[PDB]
Amino acid sequence: MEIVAPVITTFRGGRLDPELFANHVKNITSKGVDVVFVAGTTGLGPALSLQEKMELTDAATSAARRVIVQVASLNADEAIALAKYAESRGAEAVASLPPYYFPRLSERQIAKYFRDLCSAVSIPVFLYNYPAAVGRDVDARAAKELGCIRGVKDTNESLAHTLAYKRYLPQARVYNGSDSLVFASFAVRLDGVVASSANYLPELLAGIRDAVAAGDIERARSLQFLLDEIVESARHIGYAAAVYELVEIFQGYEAGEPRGPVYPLDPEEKAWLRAAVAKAKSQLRL
Amino acid sequence: MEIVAPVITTFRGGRLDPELFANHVKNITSKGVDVVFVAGTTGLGPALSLQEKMELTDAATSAARRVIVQVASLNADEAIALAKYAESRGAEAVASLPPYYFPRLSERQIAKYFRDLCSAVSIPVFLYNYPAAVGRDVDARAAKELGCIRGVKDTNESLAHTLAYKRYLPQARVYNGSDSLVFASFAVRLDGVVASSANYLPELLAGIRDAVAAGDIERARSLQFLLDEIVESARHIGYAAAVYELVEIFQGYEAGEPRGPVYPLDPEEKAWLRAAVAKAKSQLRL
Amino acid sequence: MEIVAPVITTFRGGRLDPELFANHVKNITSKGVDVVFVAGTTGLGPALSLQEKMELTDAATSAARRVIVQVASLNADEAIALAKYAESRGAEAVASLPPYYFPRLSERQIAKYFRDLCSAVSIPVFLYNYPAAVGRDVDARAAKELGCIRGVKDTNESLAHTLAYKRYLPQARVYNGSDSLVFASFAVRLDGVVASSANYLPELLAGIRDAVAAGDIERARSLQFLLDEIVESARHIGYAAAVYELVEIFQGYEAGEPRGPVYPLDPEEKAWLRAAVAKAKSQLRL
Amino acid sequence: MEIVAPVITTFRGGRLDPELFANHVKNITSKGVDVVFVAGTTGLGPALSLQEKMELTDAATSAARRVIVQVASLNADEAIALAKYAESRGAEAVASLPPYYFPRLSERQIAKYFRDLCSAVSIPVFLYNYPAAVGRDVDARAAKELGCIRGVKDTNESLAHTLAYKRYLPQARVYNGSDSLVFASFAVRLDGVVASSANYLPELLAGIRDAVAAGDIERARSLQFLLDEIVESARHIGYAAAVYELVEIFQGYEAGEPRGPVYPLDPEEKAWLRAAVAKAKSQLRL
């Protein structure tokens, strides 16, 4: 079972910094990340222009051997163009959010979007489902009804919703994206996890996976609860910005910054977070 | 009290068509539209490039005397740039959605976004609130606390939520954005309405306004109910794409197309919509 | 247009005090309440035994000329039984919540419940819709389909939702039950309001009704906002218990108390609430 | 890890039939049910009078060695009365929903409800959490703060929400109540499940438990998916009434019926369900 990192997009001086990005990717893949997922929500995907996603695709595919690229755009031609680009750069798969923002698009519109993406490339197309952010759900039955989905990332608190993709699409690779469900995902033998914490504590996720595989459910659960406490503190100050500071805290190198509306944490927020996780940090035998 | 059109963005072959747009704006403003609101949700704002939004700003300010440009972007630098551009082209105000898509941004991040817009321009900055599409609400209390909001457009079926902005911001111009609340907005004396149906039935909205002003409450209401039957059919088939077909059906000229993932309606959907609205339309006597 | 009070159920000791109830009914009906609605949510309906509701029926019909009895029970035989009892005591109508609590109920079960109710009496049966408390909505289209509904009380922040009942059911008496929409309800000419504040400020509700009729929209809105401030303070300490204390503050007599798990406000909560509404209270001229 | 049945309440004639009930309890306890949970949502608890719940308590404590009685009432005095009665009859624990139906009760009211319940008995008080039905959540933090909660049954699609009670109350016994999470609950080593399917397919739940315990984690998931198919079908016609028919289909004896507003299935619905679950039934064996 795989640890997939929905990797942060590392800005510095207003632009993408591929040196920060490459160092970060090479570190986390050394610590147990199997696959790099670029331009996911944790990577600020919908905030990135097509060219920024191309730059990120180049950086990810030159830093990691296994890369899935998130391609969604509210101009659907851009999703097709980037999917072809990712494929040419050696991505093992592409993924897409369903069309987001607009309420009450039709089922026909959603289906055409995904079918056009599948027609554009030969590599597997993944559904990246995230109803809290997207404002709609493409559930297991709908995903099967599309007729071309070969993988699912379900960023979702409902483990049963995620398991249902394995039921309706027995050949798809299915992953849950909730940090609170890493332990549970391995326990029920999903194909893997795509959790934001693979950015800052990949060795913890690997510890959970190891523990579950050894039958050590108590250790796995304990590691999970430690992770939950860290996530909880981070959510308190703006989770998406905090992920970057958590990388600095736990991995010890510069992680860059997000970009407005996802403004970087200020100095006072960074200091508060460092103290907030100091205890959980000391408890870590990984 | 004003009728404000959140005007459609008119594409041809996935490219912006400013002639279709200009003809449409000229027509609805001759039929009772007081103000043109460009790149709102009905105008596919989040789907438009910055280049497209600048072109749309040029075309709207050329075709209309009173223009508000909606500037939101998930790259905040782009919101600031377009707000300054809009001001330079003579927009009377700019509006923005709160940062959307991303769940759990912090209050500081949201406040910074709006405050940076207000500091970027001298013309009024409006809150454009649309919780169903944005995934968060900036309520009247929150809008007061921003400390620079001079207008609100509230695309919201809770009319008291919209009225609360007049309570907390007595100097602000406050509009409700729901088609189902045009009659109600005029009856409670909001500053006006920003309803998508100003695109396809602006004469019907002016008729509602006239009836309320005449104390003809029963007429205003029966006109509202006719509009509600039309909105219902349109929603059934996919509302955002449906608006374009309704413009053609009710106003009698070409309206262009939306762009995918907001794909244009297909022939069967259009035929269905035409049959669906035919009854209600006939019961109209303006 | 009517002011309908969803009257509080006055307990004293551990049990219903029908005398306190009669007195309260008499005072508010002398101050503008047109109809008394017994055992609604504000009257703690779902917490009352059949015997308590029968007792309210007797006391209300003896103290008021126009009485509607709310009869919902999760034993449908008690609803049928009480509806018959209310008719026999001279109630002008009965109302029911749809079946509540249970999430997994079919359209057929809901329709059967309302149709059996309609068969049981010859007086009008109202739908009492309150989705936030009930956990389900019976919307205008569904209410028409039931085929026997003659009135609706919609406790709902969506004025559009309530207006839809007048569209689908032109001969029904339709009331909105939100305190925040009293002004709006009279402005759009619903048949009336069934607002909790008729317990403690029936003269304010009448003042709003008078102001709308006179066309003094600005006074109507101003009175609405004062009411909103009062409701907001009450919601802070527990609205259902707070209504009783607001009756005491504004009407000057003992209102009795609710019963747990709706526990009466404690002395500190009462002192806080008195102080919280003091300014709005002094600003009240009528 | 335990299988707890939220047992159906068995009506015949519109009245309780304690002999159908006894036969049912005895059968399911012989096929792997460890504990009987009486008057839960599956048992129509909120629909039952205090006397009916006492009668159910008698029948359960006569037919089974281990009984937990669900005691919630919207008259808290009745919750206390029943808890004392359950203890007198030899129940090993009582549980309660939080106060339901009423929106926006205060934290003080909810805490007083639970603490008063704990002080009435010397047997343990469990929290029975079911946010979808109750309209409010008492999460793990809130549960710990109550200070007297000894067990938790969380009917919730969010497994991380359930797991949190083990984080905060590691001494409490914690169960998840969603049928779609039986496999997952055993996999993460909750103390067990309280799933409605214990009524009709207890042997399937015991098979899932066995398979998780071997490590045929993949056969466990396969049995769960079969259960998910059957649940899917019952949900389609109205789950609460359908549970009774599923008992007849899979266990082959008379199950009684629910009582309206939870009306029994009609002959047509029953025929539809039997055909719908025939395939699943055929692949069962066990």
XYZ file of N, CA and C in Angstrom, chain B residues 39 46 64 69-70 91 101 107 119 139 141 150 160 162 164 181 196 210 217 235 252 259 276 280:
72
model
N -18.450 39.645 -14.904
C -17.651 38.533 -14.354
C -18.153 38.037 -12.985
N -15.026 33.004 -12.301
C -13.912 32.116 -11.944
C -13.336 31.292 -13.094
N -21.778 50.395 -21.551
C -22.680 50.737 -20.459
C -22.135 51.882 -19.612
N -17.129 45.731 -11.750
C -16.353 44.583 -12.206
C -16.052 43.683 -10.992
N -16.355 42.406 -11.163
C -16.113 41.390 -10.128
C -14.709 40.861 -10.336
N -14.905 51.991 -14.153
C -15.877 51.237 -13.349
C -16.333 52.097 -12.173
N -13.133 28.047 -2.930
C -12.593 26.678 -3.059
C -11.958 26.116 -1.758
N -9.429 33.516 9.361
C -10.002 34.865 9.336
C -8.978 35.904 8.947
N -7.355 48.874 -0.348
C -6.214 49.774 -0.417
C -5.683 49.948 -1.859
N -20.745 37.329 6.673
C -22.004 37.935 7.086
C -21.890 39.395 7.393
N -21.992 41.098 10.112
C -21.057 41.439 11.198
C -19.620 41.412 10.698
N -18.243 48.992 1.027
C -19.249 50.020 0.738
C -20.479 49.526 -0.073
N -33.330 37.828 5.251
C -32.892 38.478 6.491
C -31.381 38.569 6.542
N -29.548 39.120 4.052
C -29.222 40.271 3.206
C -29.605 41.584 3.915
N -29.565 42.178 6.978
C -28.620 42.435 8.080
C -27.471 43.313 7.635
N -36.171 36.223 -5.203
C -36.395 37.303 -4.235
C -36.443 38.715 -4.841
N -29.843 37.014 -12.011
C -29.387 36.499 -13.300
C -30.438 36.720 -14.401
N -42.123 48.203 -10.854
C -43.232 49.140 -11.087
C -44.460 48.769 -10.264
N -49.281 44.853 -5.155
C -48.564 43.709 -4.581
C -48.965 42.385 -5.222
N -33.146 25.444 -14.062
C -32.328 24.713 -13.078
C -32.311 23.219 -13.322
N -34.702 37.482 -28.368
C -34.728 37.398 -29.826
C -33.455 37.814 -30.553
N -18.474 28.137 -21.729
C -17.334 27.350 -22.123
C -17.144 26.250 -21.096
N -40.623 23.666 -22.000
C -40.899 23.834 -20.575
C -41.332 25.235 -20.209
N -45.602 29.334 -18.987
C -45.295 30.502 -18.159
C -45.061 31.806 -18.959
